Design an enzyme around this catalytic site. Structure first.
Site, PDB file in Angstrom:
ATOM      1  N   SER A  14       0.820  -1.203   0.000  1.00 54.78           N
ATOM      2  CA  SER A  14       0.000   0.000   0.000  1.00 54.78           C
ATOM      3  C   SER A  14       0.855   1.256   0.000  1.00 54.78           C
ATOM      4  O   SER A  14       0.674   2.145  -0.838  1.00 54.78           O
ATOM      5  CB  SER A  14      -0.942  -0.014   1.202  1.00 54.78           C
ATOM      6  OG  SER A  14      -1.888  -1.043   1.033  1.00 54.78           O
ATOM      7  N   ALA A  15       1.802   1.351   0.934  1.00 51.61           N
ATOM      8  CA  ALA A  15       2.614   2.559   0.997  1.00 51.61           C
ATOM      9  C   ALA A  15       3.698   2.561  -0.078  1.00 51.61           C
ATOM     10  O   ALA A  15       3.906   3.574  -0.750  1.00 51.61           O
ATOM     11  CB  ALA A  15       3.235   2.700   2.385  1.00 51.61           C
ATOM     12  N   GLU A  35       9.838  -6.125  -4.869  1.00 49.58           N
ATOM     13  CA  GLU A  35       8.674  -6.757  -4.261  1.00 49.58           C
ATOM     14  C   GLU A  35       8.898  -8.258  -4.223  1.00 49.58           C
ATOM     15  O   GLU A  35       9.234  -8.865  -5.244  1.00 49.58           O
ATOM     16  CB  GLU A  35       7.402  -6.403  -5.044  1.00 49.58           C
ATOM     17  CG  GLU A  35       6.171  -7.230  -4.702  1.00 49.58           C
ATOM     18  CD  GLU A  35       5.842  -7.253  -3.215  1.00 49.58           C
ATOM     19  OE1 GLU A  35       5.845  -6.185  -2.566  1.00 49.58           O
ATOM     20  OE2 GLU A  35       5.582  -8.361  -2.697  1.00 49.58           O
ATOM     21  N   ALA A  36       8.724  -8.854  -3.041  1.00 55.82           N
ATOM     22  CA  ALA A  36       8.931 -10.290  -2.902  1.00 55.82           C
ATOM     23  C   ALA A  36       7.885 -11.090  -3.662  1.00 55.82           C
ATOM     24  O   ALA A  36       8.170 -12.205  -4.108  1.00 55.82           O
ATOM     25  CB  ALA A  36       8.917 -10.679  -1.423  1.00 55.82           C
ATOM     26  N   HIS A 392      -4.704  -5.526  11.180  1.00 56.33           N
ATOM     27  CA  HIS A 392      -4.340  -4.113  11.152  1.00 56.33           C
ATOM     28  C   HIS A 392      -2.998  -3.879  11.836  1.00 56.33           C
ATOM     29  O   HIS A 392      -2.787  -2.879  12.521  1.00 56.33           O
ATOM     30  CB  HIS A 392      -5.434  -3.271  11.795  1.00 56.33           C
ATOM     31  CG  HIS A 392      -6.744  -3.356  11.078  1.00 56.33           C
ATOM     32  ND1 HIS A 392      -7.950  -3.107  11.693  1.00 56.33           N
ATOM     33  CD2 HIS A 392      -7.036  -3.662   9.793  1.00 56.33           C
ATOM     34  CE1 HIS A 392      -8.928  -3.254  10.819  1.00 56.33           C
ATOM     35  NE2 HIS A 392      -8.400  -3.591   9.659  1.00 56.33           N
TER      36      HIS A 392
END
Ligand SMILES: Cc1cc2nc3c(=O)[nH]c(=O)nc-3n(C[C@H](O)[C@H](O)[C@H](O)COP(=O)(O)OP(=O)(O)OC[C@H]3O[C@@H](n4cnc5c(N)ncnc54)[C@H](O)[C@@H]3O)c2cc1C
Length: 458
Positions: A14-15, A35-36, A392
């Site tokens: 997201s970030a 990115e994995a 979260h």
């Protein structure tokens, strides 16, 4: 390190996807995103992080899913001003409600029933005020989730930030299936990253610096593997210490919730339904402390009791110095007796609501907790056994103004130059809601901060 970029971004969630999109807006700034996961649950697109036995739940061991996919997977952002003002009160200078509101608007720019009515009517009768403009930027009271509020905005997914640049910006490069193992630090400065892909060990260099956007579990792990963290932790795994940073992997926070269910005649895991109620269990609380949600699809209605702001705190540590090992995670979902008290109080409110007119006029039988569960101790038993995390997870790389914080309010890792953390790990406290939107917002404001720092010498 043959390849050299201005910025390397670790993590395309997201970030990280926001940072990649925003930093590559400048033609002369080259950006590499690692990115994995791949493009487009199960180990293919889920990390499945194990959590240590939870003493608050008789050693129960949960599995925390986490996106392992570019952008993400699995909208509207009703900003709770109390939460962001609390961030600034704990040292996140500039991240107060007035500070994040422009970036929720920038996110909006980028983006270009009877049972629910019955439930809301019953809440009003029991005395839960209806949420409206007089409340300000709080969601205190009962209102419908699927609506447009004066204190809410619209935002996009991270996959919208990647779709506009992937294969379209020459100064942007993407490596999928890239498992970052370590941040390379030389002369107090983050100058590159080591990662593995396709069974091979790779290294790549950053001219201006490295952005750690791996999320609240993997970011603290990566800092530890890079020598940034508590001296005791690092020595145990014989990792050379670069920065004694006491709070790397501390302050971990998650939202607990539990389901109540009723049959009638005429999911909630992440906590969004048709109607919500941010209420106070006692008047001794300064902000609503419990969230009540209803998502009404023999036939039954699903209700949830969530704790807006956890009091428990957890940790992220290494299992070993082996980068491919998963982190050691400890989190007592119900580690504070008052967390249970509030959730038991929450369960009693949901009962008052269901038993009050007009929702009671469609009620049949309580189904999941059980009508016979009535005493405080009987409800505590049910909560300890059926409570679950809402996914979260945040706050493991705290930003703040004190010297013990992991990053300063400008998101720079203390002790190192050209190194930032831009993801949900920097949150000082877990907000009551809008977690994914808050993480996107952090990417938005973090990108501005990094762009500002690049205009002037470090
Ligand atoms: C299953 C699930 C459902 C959710 N549902 C909701 C919801 O309905 N509403 C809501 O508000 N929030 C929801 N959330 C929470 C929300 O998705 C997160 O708060 C948010 O994505 C956090 O963003 P982030 O950038 O901090 O981390 P992430 O989005 O997790 O991004 C981190 C990225 O870094 C990658 N990465 C990790 N380690 C490495 C490494 N070593 N090398 C390279 N890349 C790496 C990961 O694969 C991932 O792509 C949900 C979370 C989960 C897991």
């Amino acid at each position: 390190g043959s390849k050299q970029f201005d910025y390397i971004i670790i993590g395309g969630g997201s970030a990280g996807a926001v940072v990649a999109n925003r930093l590559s807006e400048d033609s002369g700034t080259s950006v590499l995103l690692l990115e994995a996961g791949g493009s487009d649950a199960s180990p293919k697109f889920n990390w499945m992080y194990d959590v240590e036995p939870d003493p608050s739940r008789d050693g129960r061991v949960d599995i925390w899913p986490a996106g392992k996919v570019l952008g993400g997977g699995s909208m509207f952002v009703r900003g709770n001003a109390w939460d962001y003002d609390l961030w600034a009160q704990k040292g996140a200078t500039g991240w107060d409600y007035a500070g994040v509101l422009p970036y929720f608007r920038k996110m909006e720019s980028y983006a270009l029933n009877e049972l629910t009515d019955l439930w809301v009517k019953s809440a009003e009768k029991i005395g839960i005020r209806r949420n409206d403009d007089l409340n300000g930027a709080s969601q205190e009271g009962v209102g419908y989730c699927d609506a447009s509020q004066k204190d809410g905005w619209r935002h996009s997914t991270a996959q919208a930030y990647i779709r506009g640049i992937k294969g379209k910006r020459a100064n942007f490069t993407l490596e999928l299936k890239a498992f970052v193992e370590r941040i390379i630090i030389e002369g107090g400065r983050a100058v590159g990253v080591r990662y593995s892909k396709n069974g091979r060990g790779m290294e790549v260099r950053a001219r201006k610096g490295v952005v750690l956007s791996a999320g609240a579990i993997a970011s603290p792990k990566l800092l530890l593997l890079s020598g940034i963290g508590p001296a005791e932790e690092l020595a145990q795994h014989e990792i050379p210490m670069v920065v004694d940073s006491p709070d790397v992997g501390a302050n971990l926070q998650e939202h607990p919730a539990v389901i109540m269910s009723f049959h009638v005649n005429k999911p909630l895991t992440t906590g969004i339904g048709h109607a919500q109620a941010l209420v106070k269990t006692d008047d001794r609380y300064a902000a609503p402390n419990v969230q009540l949600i209803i998502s009404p699809f023999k036939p039954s209605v699903g209700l949830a009791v969530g704790l807006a702001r956890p009091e428990s705190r957890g940790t992220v540590r290494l299992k070993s110095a082996d980068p491919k090992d998963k982190p050691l995670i400890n989190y007592p979902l119900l580690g504070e007796q008052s967390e249970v008290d509030q959730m038991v109080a929450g369960c009693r409110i949901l009962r008052k609501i269901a038993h009050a007119e007009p929702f009671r006029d469609v009620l049949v039988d309580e189904r999941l907790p059980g009508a016979e569960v009535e005493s405080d101790a009987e409800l505590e038993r049910y909560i300890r056994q059926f409570a679950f995390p809402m996914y979260h997870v945040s706050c493991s790389c705290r930003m703040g103004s004190d010297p013990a914080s992991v990053v300063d309010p400008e998101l720079r890792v203390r002790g190192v130059s050209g190194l930032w953390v831009v993801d949900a790990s920097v949150m000082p406290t877990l907000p009551a809601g809008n977690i994914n939107a808050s993480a996107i917002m952090i990417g938005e404001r973090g990108a501005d901060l990094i762009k500002q720092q690049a205009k002037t010498p470090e």
